Design a protein around this ligand. Structure first.
Ligand SMILES: [Ca+2]
Ligand SMILES: [Ca+2]
Ligand SMILES: [Ca+2]
Ligand SMILES: [Ca+2]
Ligand SMILES: [Cl-]
Ligand SMILES: [Cl-]
Ligand SMILES: [Cl-]
Ligand SMILES: [Cl-]
Ligand SMILES: [Cl-]
Ligand SMILES: [Cl-]
Ligand SMILES: [Cl-]
Ligand SMILES: [Cl-]
Ligand SMILES: [Mn+2]
Ligand SMILES: [Mn+2]
Ligand SMILES: [Mn+2]
Ligand SMILES: [Mn+2]
Ligand code: NA
Ligand code: NA
Ligand code: NA
Ligand code: NA
Lengths: 237, 237, 237, 237
């Protein structure tokens, strides 16, 4: 199986797998059963922004999600990712629907990783920023139902031509290049990601959510990972 | 009195004010008596690099110092700087000598502060990077004995024309513009600084050290802050 | 008198000072009579974005202005700014109204200047980015009628509480720190600026425009520089 | 055949293919016979730095090369790269030796490409920075004789364990991800690259040089491109 570290924006409460009884943001370390969660007052049909941060000195994976005119939600978990993830990874976004559904539209996505060594010329960095997505976005690996280019956006899950989200959908987008997240000479290592999203559902109960994730380089959508599994995990263990 | 948050590279052990019995790096919150320290294997005459990091989600002020071919030293302290510092600050470097002495030469200095709001256009930022210093560096406020331009460097404390550091010296350099470190709409705030330095002494016992500091905007060198007080504090309380 | 280099977004045609008979963008080198102009299909009440670019290798000052869903306008002028501007400058935004009027609202403003030397550690940089403006924006020098904080924006010229722009207004905002634009060791020097703006008028004929400008450090609004002079020049010479 | 745009640091004068009678820097558009050249006072065994710049408004490909304590060399050529290169490219470094030889050592390499659209959220960017190279640098495609990790450097051409450069060698390194260099909505597009290099030869006549290049995504070393062809071209046409 793949190795997954993720921040979930979980829109549907599956209480038998540890979700609280409301939409929430969570830190997922190798399991869909979040290590830490916080209540998320998700707004159907509104554009929100998520920020994810981590550094090797503090060893705390943190996330903040907000909408204009609203308070933020935040969640943090103390974890040494050097002990979870391999030295080289890919980074991505994932989303799913199940018997309940929503659009999982990404309007923008940025990422920066840095490794500062003890040499006088210390800094290695990777940065990418998408504020629009082309019909042929060659620097993204699209998996499952994910598509790019419709209204300049990344649609992680299936949407019909009239905007209607489809159930039982899963899709991911990964940046094309492998990312160096640990190095033997690095004295400070850090990563951050930001994405803006539009989750809209014609229903009172949207599902299932969007995640930012970091994985082994050859990661692929696990079998049967629609719905509550967010395209990230093969089961709910 | 001024309000000071600082990371000290303390080259001389003053044990009656809480210094350990060796050169060390420390986190100073409104006092020269560091809240946290770590042993620092300072290398007389070698160019080193210091990194300082903080963000408002984790509320941990951390620093790493290293030399090429050597292990790093690191120190961290949990502190909500929103409860210490004002909303607007200046940032700077400070150094001192006393009856023992050293050069306090800065070869480069960079700083980045960011405030990300809950608006869709979220980011405010300030960044500066000096890899050399002019004889007339108009975007730096020089205090005390600090000078710029000699060999393209910033000399925080007095050095003679032949390279000899002078005792009983104190000097600081602050970036000209005020820096916005907290804002009511910010959902993520962060700062980082890096500087490279050359501390050299003709003596077996160098003193007193270099600090990166954040202060009220009108901060000035306190009276009698040579030596163990690092140009930062009026006393050892 | 001050020394001014500016890119003008000129909303009102003053044909006796060389304006074409339509709104236009122009490169102004020490005179309001632009050295080069291009037609600008200004859209009353819509948010637009302007980009300004220059580097010391190509010695060409260029600007691009656009609105969503519209083609851009662009203008360029070959000029060695080393022969116009001093070594240290301030950078700013300026706007005016006269007997005709408009809002001159700035929603965001960013700037980056770089000096790369022939040393192995080559880069000096200054960068600032405002995507919102506080009621007390301490890193901006506000001149004339300019204010910050209303709806998080920078209003360069006077607007009443109900949104009504006032005539005979002039105002500027300059970044607090001096900016190093030329240095003897620099092998590549460059600057860029971007700003987003909302020019709205209740009238069919808005006036007078907005400019991004670079000036001597002590620059101030010239006397009688309302209207066609854009807050930049004391006369139309 | 591949499509190549390159900046050459040409260490050996091949006068029958248009080289001047000295080491030189050149702009190569689809041919090793540079469209523009400038004299380059190459220093055997010294670390130098090259900068390459281009933007879609000015349509001028420019390069600057320097060593510490020395004047720079610069070359520029007016060319609309939209008419040369495809929309998506890869970027890389190339070097060669022939019957004359040199080390072609890369100590650092950075690249930034930006596409700014007419949307209010305008910016797309890719940036990478290597100040060291790992024995397994997964985000680089190494071609021919190129290797990474020896002393933390990228060796484009073959070097023995004792530092001796080998003749008849060719090697390239390309960034793993495709790069978007033109887009239909982009109102400003730009790229820049910097690399630091050490060319050393035990001989009075080093050869053949190093190039920064942009190519079709599937570019590969052409047959027989050792020596004067710099790993870039299949012939001298
Ligand atoms: Ca769930
Ligand atoms: Ca001490
Ligand atoms: Ca006019
Ligand atoms: Ca040649
Ligand atoms: Cl939210
Ligand atoms: Cl529900
Ligand atoms: Cl150290
Ligand atoms: Cl001692
Ligand atoms: Cl426009
Ligand atoms: Cl008119
Ligand atoms: Cl050179
Ligand atoms: Cl020769
Ligand atoms: Mn959950
Ligand atoms: Mn101490
Ligand atoms: Mn005009
Ligand atoms: Mn040549
Ligand atoms: Na939403
Ligand atoms: Na030292
Ligand atoms: Na407008
Ligand atoms: Na060389």
């Amino acid at each position: 199986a793949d190795t997954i570290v993720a921040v979930e924006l979980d829109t549907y409460p599956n209480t038998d797998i540890g979700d609280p009884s409301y939409p929430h943001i969570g830190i997922d370390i190798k399991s869909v059963r979040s290590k830490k969660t916080a209540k998320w007052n998700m707004q159907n049909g509104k554009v929100g922004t998520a920020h994810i941060i981590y550094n090797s000195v503090d060893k705390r994976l943190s996330a903040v999600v907000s909408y204009p005119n609203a308070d933020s939600a935040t969640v943090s978990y103390d974890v040494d990712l050097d002990n979870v993830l391999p030295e080289w990874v890919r980074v991505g976004l994932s989303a799913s629907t199940g018997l309940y559904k929503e659009t999982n539209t990404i309007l923008s996505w940025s990422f920066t990783s840095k490794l500062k060594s003890n040499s006088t010329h210390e800094t290695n960095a990777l940065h990418f920023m998408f504020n629009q997505f082309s019909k042929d976005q060659k620097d993204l690996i699209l998996q499952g139902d994910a598509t790019t280019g419709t209204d300049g956006n990344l649609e992680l899950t299936r949407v019909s031509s009239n905007g209607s989200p489809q159930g039982s959908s899963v899709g991911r987008a990964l940046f094309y290049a492998p990312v160096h997240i640990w190095e033997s000479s690095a004295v400070v290592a850090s990563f951050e990601a930001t994405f803006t999203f539009l989750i809209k559902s014609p229903d009172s109960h949207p599902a299932d959510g969007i995640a930012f994730f970091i994985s082994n380089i050859d990661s692929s959508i696990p079998s049967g990972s629609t719905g509550r599994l967010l395209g990230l995990f093969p089961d709910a263990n």
